[PDB]
């Protein structure tokens, strides 16, 4: 099944309807899990998604990183050099000095008391005053990743460089947005590179054992420090995806207020279990990661399809997430589809459930902040399901394109606390 033609432009005017687009367009069948291939960038780009399409991305015997994500999107969105592009020993071993801060267990649990804390200073912020989710728990996720990293400055200096964050985030997808990304993406760059660069000369003390100090002391596979500016941005690549926890937050919001008899249930439990479930089904239903991009490192086949070495092959998140076969009702809304699982170290036991990629942290290129993302989003389920909430109902405040990456409601959500 080919498109023919060049389609780069479509992929920006179809958004997250690129890959379901493509596939009728082929002629395929709904829900069909037949590869699509497409001209995408000069090169061939194979489209796949479901459990079999996971096998195939994540098998890196025949398939690399490197040059796959256009620069235009990851220079702006990850920065230079950094994990996402590195293949082999080289990547293990930056994946392992990151994941060592992001996924373990115990990083994990100091982060839930900062986050609690700063999402209940934000949902304070609202009582009687015109609060807005995306922008005030996207700051508030922000703070609480800088507390968690040891990065210790000024108040008004954190809460202007998640600022600048969150406008990277808000604006590396579009054409009208991309300067802007790409100015903040510099600025960032420039301060973690003399953060970093403070503490290797003693001008800065980082916390024993604190992410700071563990990006400062980042290391390649030959032993030797990684440059500066590369270690900032590894630095931002800890603490930059925990704001933008802020979109699935935004979502959490419409999600509540379509789904009040769940807010009851959120709101009278003691145990935690519904909010989990519920942001679970937050990050499986709502779009966040269209699709994610790798090549192909020799010549290989995939169910018929010739794969050829230098093309890419994409994963259809949203079509994996959404996909029929993977999934009963995959178009409902339903957090009883995770009610049975307590954490998020058994929700990777569910293939297809990869709204921050698929396969193994440690060996492979799956992201490690999935228990950060959850700890935060339920933190914010919790407080936005409360009573004394309330969440507009109006259409720009419920509504989202999908024709734009990333997708929000327009208005941010906007929200504000019953006071006496
Ligand atoms: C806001 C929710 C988040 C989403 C939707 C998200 C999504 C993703 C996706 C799709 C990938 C690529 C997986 C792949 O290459 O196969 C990724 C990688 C990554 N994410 Fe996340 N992420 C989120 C939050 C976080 C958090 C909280 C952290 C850490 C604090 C984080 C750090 C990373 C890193 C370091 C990588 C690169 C891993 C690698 O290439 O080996 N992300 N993320
Ligand atoms: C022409 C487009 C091809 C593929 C485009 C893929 C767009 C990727 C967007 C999501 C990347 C995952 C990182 C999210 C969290 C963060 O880095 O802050
Ligand atoms: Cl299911």
Same mark, same amino acid.
């Given at each position: 099944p080919r498109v023919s033609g060049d389609r780069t432009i479509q992929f920006l005017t179809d958004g997250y309807l690129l890959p379901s687009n493509l596939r009728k367009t082929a002629g395929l069948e709904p829900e069909s899990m037949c590869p699509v291939t497409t001209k995408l960038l000069g090169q061939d780009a194979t489209i796949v998604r479901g459990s079999a399409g996971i096998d195939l991305f994540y098998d890196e015997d025949v398939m690399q990183? @490197? /040059?796959?994500? #256009?620069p235009v999107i990851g220079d702006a969105l *990850?920065?230079? /050099?950094?994990? !996402?592009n590195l293949d082999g020993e080289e990547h293990k071993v930056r994946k392992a000095q990151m994941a060592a801060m992001a996924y373990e267990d115990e990083r994990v649990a100091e982060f839930a008391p900062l986050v609690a804390e700063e999402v209940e200073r934000a949902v304070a912020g609202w009582e009687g005053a015109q609060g807005n989710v995306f922008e005030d728990l996207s700051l508030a996720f922000g703070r609480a990743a800088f507390r968690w990293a040891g990065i210790d400055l000024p108040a008004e200096n954190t809460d202007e460089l998640v600022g600048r964050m969150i406008t990277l985030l808000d604006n590396f997808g579009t054409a009208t947005g991309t300067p802007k990304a790409f100015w903040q993406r510099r600025q960032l760059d420039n301060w973690a590179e003399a953060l970093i660069t403070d503490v290797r000369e003693g001008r800065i003390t980082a916390r024993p054992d604190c992410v700071l100090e563990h990006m400062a002391q980042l290391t390649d596979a030959s032993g030797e420090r990684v440059d500066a500016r590369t270690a900032g941005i590894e630095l931002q690549n800890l603490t930059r995806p925990t704001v933008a926890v802020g979109f699935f937050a935004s979502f959490a919001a419409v999600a509540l207020a379509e789904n009040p008899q769940w807010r009851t249930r959120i709101n009278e439990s003691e145990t935690g279990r519904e909010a989990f479930a519920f942001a679970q089904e937050v990050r499986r239903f709502? +779009? $966040? *990661?269209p699709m994610f991009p790798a090549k192909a490192t020799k010549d290989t086949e995939f169910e018929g399809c010739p794969i050829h070495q230098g093309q890419r092959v994409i994963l259809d998140f949203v079509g994996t997430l959404h996909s029929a076969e993977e999934w009963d009702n995959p178009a409902s809304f339903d957090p009883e589809r995770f009610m049975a699982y307590e954490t998020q170290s058994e929700a @990777?036991?569910?293939? +297809? $459930? =990869? +709204?921050?990629? /698929?396969?193994?942290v440690r060996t492979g !290129?799956?992201? #490690? /902040?999935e228990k950060i993302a959850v700890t935060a989003l339920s933190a914010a389920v919790e407080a936005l399901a409360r009573p004394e909430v309330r969440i507009s109902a109006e259409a720009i405040d419920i509504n989202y394109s999908?024709? @734009? =990456?990333?997708?929000? +409601?327009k208005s941010g959500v906007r929200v504000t606390v019953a006071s006496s």
């Open positions: 990183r @490197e /040059g796959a994500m #256009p *990850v920065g230079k /050099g950094a994990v !996402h709502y +779009p $966040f *990661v @990777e036991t569910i293939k +297809p $459930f =990869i +709204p921050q990629g /698929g396969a193994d !290129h799956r992201c #490690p /902040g999908m024709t @734009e =990456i990333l997708a929000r +409601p």
